[PDB]
């Protein structure tokens, strides 16, 4: 968010409209890795073994 805010304060206004799709997709992809992700050996019942 700081990168986008820094660019907006600087005045580039490149992310307005469809340009915003880059920050949006990235922020979603980061969400998938940190919240769901996959467990280690402590979570033995990973879908392919169960």
Partner 1 sequence: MKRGFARPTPEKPPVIKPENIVLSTPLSIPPPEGKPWWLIVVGVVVVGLL
Q: Does 9 bind partner 1 (CB under 8 A)?
A: no
- Least CB distance from residue 30 to partner 1, whole Å? 7
Q: What is the three-state SS of the chain?
A: CHHHHHHHHHCCCCCCHHHHHHHHHHHHHHHHHHHHCCCCCCCCCCCCCC
Using CB under 8 A as the binding rule, the residues of this chain from 20 to 39 that contact partner 1 are 22, 25-26, 29-30, 32-33, 37-38
Which positions lie near partner 1, rule CB under 8 A?
22, 25-26, 29-30, 32-33, 37-38, 46, 48-49
């Amino acid at each position: 968010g700081g990168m986008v805010a820094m660019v907006f304060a600087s005045g580039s206004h490149v992310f307005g409209g469809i340009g915003s799709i880059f920050p949006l997709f990235m922020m979603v992809g980061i969400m998938m890795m940190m919240f769901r992700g996959m467990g280690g050996g402590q979570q033995q019942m990973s879908r392919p073994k169960l």
